[PDB]
């Protein structure tokens, strides 16, 4: 039993799982294991147990945590049912608290209850009065006695009132019901008993929890200290960046086991926004197009092309040798009209190019001056209508011929040299909405905890409200008029006679980089002038959004019409009027974050609202969650370093990158993937993003929230793996066609997550390395994303929530010469390499080592930062690590030395020569010096014999100014330094001791040993590492 029941302890468990007879049942167990019992004397012991039990009960406000009512009771002297098991050694009782069975006992199958007490399968439980019995049943709550009052509980009490009335009271008054128990300490048989149960929750409404996080959602990083000033407010004003997960907890007392939930997010901004739009098609009656104009069709990102629609009375349009047949046909009250759809381009194309799938035209009906409309169709009455391309070389002109009513007309098109891109710039009130799902499980009923995406990759709709307006002029037999919409789109009506219709209109699409042409919305206005009691001028028009796929432009949904009416009895008149207008665009999965960021809904001023839905038991939340958005640029830093950092194998230079927008999952080393499907939400089905924790990618089938739902074999499973080459780098593997759809905390691949269009990413983010002078860079053109494994550091013990990510990425760099020319089979050690996890090795040759360097560049991983900060270059940062020059010296221990001594010290000192012990320098031939160091190891590679310098000359000046330079023959080096080898004095110290033989020097000169030999000694060495020479001297003295 989890949690445990203690020695001599009481404990309680709320009954749950399939086969549990009723809601609001709690069991109590007393661990009577500590004493002897038999059927002969059991009635004593069970009676002894029950009399000491006390039970407490409350009603609470589920949001605020306030106690509303409290009651406290004990079992009656008789009429209870209470039971014993010899096998599991417990006394126990079950009590039924909510309606029904508040007052009457409900039977409990011995099968079900045995799940908790398996002894009930081993043998029958004992009853009161000591018999074996086949069944267990509740003691009802209304039977018990008020400890305050010494009477059976009355129907007037608010707690018993509430418990019987929970069904509506949970929602209507935010009421929650809670119970706990305690066994008043007592002695039996020289043993004793004591305890208090953990609280159990009977019921509560379905809500976002509001304690301690008063917004229901929280960012673990803001709560710990790692975000500056904003940490002060983590409990009531949560923030998060664009593509990541934010944490939350729900209470659900209905469900059991795992539960799919679905969420609805609504995004909003204070004040109106300036938006860019572009013209896809212009549609008109042949009277409204101008006598001549110059035009050439534009081509959108998807590959679709702009078109021109002409409506006419005639069965053809005619142009000499060229005949143009209509695309479709319609009628208004028996009068017949045809629609011709044209692309002005390259050549007179006989077969179709693209289509409109369905298209609504709208007119004021004579019957009412109230809007009506129809779908234009083919002659065979099918819906999709062909569009055709026509034209020629630049500067060519075509005349088309047609009729409007009984009057012929001609229009002259000049095929322009450059595409006719046209824009509208409007201010709109805009808002958006989106949907999402995940499958949450719990270790602790009734609390379900999870995370959800800041921006789900799925269809989003963006919607707004604006104005349309007309100015008009009336005459005895005709009207003239103009309209404005979308701030600076203008349409103009040719003067309409009494008893004639005419049309104008536009299809428009957003004007930005990636998404142009992919979604659009159509407005067509019919107009009418007629006379009743007054002259009547009237407008009626469709508003309908569309999307483009496979050269079809299609009605996604169709909205309610609008109308305007102007009237006067006066023959001369000027008039004015206005109406609201609606505007809806729908996005597509790969494009959704980019779209929100471009339109301006995502930024430091954005606020989000969130509501939730339980798929299985069908409930919506009685409250909402709230959070706000953020955009933050990166920064780079390093711990101060000196010459020590490059001496010895256990030293390095640390660089830290601060970039919070690269943390997508708050657990460092966490991974999730995502796909798009239909989701159940309330009484409807909508598309939305489904999150799936792990390293695998799915193309799932069916509808999320029903038995139709099934996810097949993984299409790919990404992994970081060890690989070939010296050291052993860890790097990413997986089919990169699916890399958008995968999320991680590694900046060297994260920039793909939802940021790929036409198979290519919009941002080249992440880390870049270049190194000098031995020419090397990472990554090579050949490299996968995720060429190195690189993770954010995790929060430590005094932090409230340990083990969660900090925005710091900590990266370690080694530069050395000592392992140059080491080998690993065929491999030769040269240049730059990745090692372990966050580690780089740069290896160079001996003379190239001083002044060598690495430059690191960091570019942001998130498209919001590229958008708001492009102006200033604040989205990229640099740092450089370089090896400084150091002082070196050669010295005798004293300026003077006696010819009494046989030998003297001569010390060479240079920091960069220092290593682990032992290490030694062997001399020989023409003054060569060879460095050796068998205890040097670095990631398994080990140092080879290095030639670091040479002794240049060995000289004496004699007592008269004559100078002798001793030639560096083998015999001369042999005699002068019989200890041919120098030794390091202390670990990683720069110092070695040589010993120069004065008793040698005497004989070596062939001089009169002491007689003439008041002399000065002078010696010189050259090192390749600094490029300096070192020189040293001593006076040789004898008794005078
Ligand atoms: C905020 O919400 C975050 C949601 O993203 C939570 O992150 C999840 O953290 C889990 C562990 O958290 C525990 O420890 C932290 C301290 O770091 C505590 O604060 C928490 O209270 C909690 O105690 C983590 O679970 C995994 O690691 C556990 C080790 O601690 C281990 O016992 C589990 O078995 C998990 O492996 C989640 O990490 C991912 O978990 C999923 C499985 S599941 O989602 O847990 O069911 C793994 O997917 C699986 O991968 C295996 C490969 O071996 C496949 O075989 C299998 O098909 C597939 O399901 C992921 O690999 C693993 O990374 C982590 N969730 C995610 C998606 O990252 C976070 O804890 C919340 N914060 C707080 C304060 O509660
Ligand atoms: C969205 O709001 C975020 C919260 O303020 C902003 O994040 C903060 O970014 C600051 C640097 O960018 C600032 O300067 C730009 C022009 O140079 C301009 O776009 C904005 O003015 C923008 O805020 C950075 O603040 C530093 O610079 C400020 C100059 O305006 C100065 O007021 C600050 O004292 C600071 O030097 C923030 O970095 C953090 O600064 C903390 C100081 S405090 O602001 O908490 O007092 C410090 O404790 C911490 O170590 C350091 O990281 C940075 N804030 C955060 C949360 O890290 C963000 O830029 C706004 N986004 C937009 C769209 O502008
Ligand atoms: C698509 O079909 C259209 C309909 O038949 C064609 O439109 C006609 O275009 C003529 C020009 O096309 C010629 O020159 C092109 C080079 O710029 C070449 O690519 C074509 O192969 C073709 O040879 C145009 O003729 C006008 O321009 C001529 C310049 O070369 C010149 O002859 C005159 O200046 C002339 O006005 C047609 O316009 C009409 O021409 C009538 C005389 S005739 O040329 O038919 O003999 C004239 O009476 C009338 O005023 C004028 O409007 C024009 N036809 C119409 C009425 O649309 C188009 O070429 C086809 N496109 C391709 C290349 O496939
Ligand atoms: C949320 O997570 C729940 C787990 O916590 C999921 O329940 C598990 O469902 C498993 C199959 O999942 C697949 O089919 C679902 C449609 O029914 C679909 O919703 C899922 O997305 C997914 O495509 C199921 O595993 C059984 O079937 C497997 C074949 O797919 C087979 O490999 C298994 O051996 C197993 O028979 C689990 O159901 C039950 O599992 C018992 C234990 S075990 O064998 O898994 O160890 C088994 O004894 C019993 O016969 C079987 O019915 C089930 N897991 C558990 C432990 O309950 C749930 O589907 C998820 N909900 C959604 C909507 O995604
Ligand atoms: C440390 O760096 C020093 C500076 O770069 C290197 O110094 C160079 O020394 C070369 C001789 O060293 C060779 O033999 C060693 C055996 O004792 C061996 O350990 C070395 O790996 C290396 O192979 C010297 O090269 C010349 O002398 C050779 C006679 O031994 C002869 O065979 C060569 O043909 C060559 O003339 C370099 O001196 C300069 O060399 C120039 C050409 S190049 O060798 O640099 O390509 C030449 O144009 C010029 O006239 C001559 O003075 C000398 N390099 C420089 C630029 O001073 C030292 O070897 C490195 N130590 C190690 C072990 O890495
Ligand atoms: C419709 O869709 C396409 C494809 O995304 C887009 O073309 C690309 O536009 C960018 C810049 O976009 C902005 O400026 C143009 C006007 O120049 C506006 O129309 C847009 O609304 C944007 O405000 C061009 O610069 C691209 O040319 C490429 O530039 C790259 C550098 S970049 O950082 O500037 O993008 C170079 O690396 C490429 O070599 C070069 O081709 C252009 N891309 C292509 C493939 O032509 C259109 O502008 C969009 N048109 C509409 C209606 O807005
Ligand atoms: C565009 O013109 C089309 C004709 O070119 C119109 O299509 C016709 O629509 C009628 C009424 O909806 C439909 O019944 C016709 O189908 C034919 O019906 C014939 C019998 S009858 O209707 O002539 O009495 C049958 O011979 C046979 O079932 C169909 O051929 C349909 N006509 C054709 C030729 O398909 C269409 O209505 C028009 N669009 C508008 C809105 O004006
Ligand atoms: C839109 O244009 C149509 C032309 O394709 C018009 O069609 C006309 O049909 C009417 C019957 O409704 C018929 O009287 C016409 O027949 C011709 O009459 C000519 C002279 S006139 O009467 O138009 O002045 C003669 O020249 C000729 O030999 C006849 O064939 C017919 N008009 C034509 C010229 O064919 C129609 O008026 C119009 N519809 C709408 C919606 O207003
Ligand atoms: C009363 O006290 C006993 C002393 O604390 C204690 O027994 C110890 O705990 C477990 C045995 O009980 C559990 O395990 C079984 C499943 O194997 C369940 O059926 C049961 O409900 C309990 O969860 C055992 O591991 C441990 O060795 C025992 N310790 C010793 C040495 O006595 C019981 O936990 C408690 N009595 C009962 C039966 O609940
Ligand atoms: C219930 O009855 C049993 C006897 O049936 C009691 O167990 C005996 O107790 C004595 C001392 O108390 C022990 O020395 C024996 O080992 C036990 N005998 C048997 C037969 O087990 C038990 O103590 C009684 N319990 C109570 C509380 O009265
Ligand atoms: C979030 O947006 C949704 C739009 O889906 C809104 O919910 C709608 O409410 C309107 C009336 O305000 C009703 O016509 C619909 O029944 C609701 N829509 C659907 C599809 O359920 C609502 O405006 C926003 N909700 C919140 C949390 O404010
Ligand atoms: C490295 O080792 C040398 C050993 O020669 C150290 O030199 C000695 O320094 C102390 C004081 O620090 C003097 O008392 C001695 O006289 C020096 N020895 C000789 C032979 O002169 C040197 O201090 C060490 N340096 C570092 C950086 O560890
Ligand atoms: C390290 O610094 C030393 C000292 O300034 C440099 O060597 C000196 O400068 C020139 C070389 O251009 C020589 O002629 C002198 O003899 C050197 N001076 C001394 C004190 O002997 C050296 O250039 C620097 N090393 C590197 C490679 O950066
Ligand atoms: C759009 O045109 C194409 C012809 O390529 C056809 O696939 C489709 O039936 C039309 N409309 C739709 C998507 O119904």
Author numbering: 30 to 1069
The authors write:
Surface layers (S-layers) are resilient two-dimensional protein lattices that encapsulate many bacteria and most archaea. In archaea, S-layers usually form the only structural component of the cell wall and thus act as the final frontier between the cell and its environment. Sulfolobus acidocaldarius is a hyperthermophilic and acidophilic Crenarchaeon and thrives in acidic thermal soils and hot springs worldwide. The Sulfolobales S-layer lattice stands out from others because it is a two-component lattice, consisting of the S-layer-forming SlaA and the membrane anchor SlaB.
A pH shift from acidic (~pH 4) to alkaline (~pH 10) induces the disassembly of the lattice into its component subunits, while a reassembly occurs upon shifting the pH back to acidic. Asking whether this pH shift-induced assembly and disassembly mechanism is based on a conformational change or partial unfolding of SlaA, we investigated the structure of SlaA at different pH conditions. Purified SlaA proteins were frozen at pH 7 and 10 and their structure was determined using the SPA pipeline in Relion and 3.1. The resulting cryoEM maps had global resolutions of 3.9 Å for SlaA at pH 7 and 3.2 Å for SlaA at pH 10. As for SlaA at pH 4, domains D5 and D6 were too flexible to be resolved in the cryoEM maps. Strikingly, the cryoEM maps of SlaA30–1069 at the three pH conditions were virtually identical, demonstrating a remarkable pH stability of this protein. (root-mean-square deviation) value of C⍺ atoms between the pH 4 and 10 structures was 0.79 Å (min. = 0.02 Å; max. = 2.6 Å), confirming that SlaA30–1069 maintains its structure unchanged across a surprisingly broad pH range. This suggests that a pH-induced conformational change or unfolding in SlaA30–1069 is not the cause for S-layer disassembly. An analysis of the surface charges of SlaA, including the glycans, at pH 4, 7, and 10 revealed that the overall protein charge changes from positive at pH 4 to negative at pH 10. This change in electrostatic surface potential may be a key factor in disrupting protein–protein interactions within the S-layer, causing its disassembly at alkaline pH.
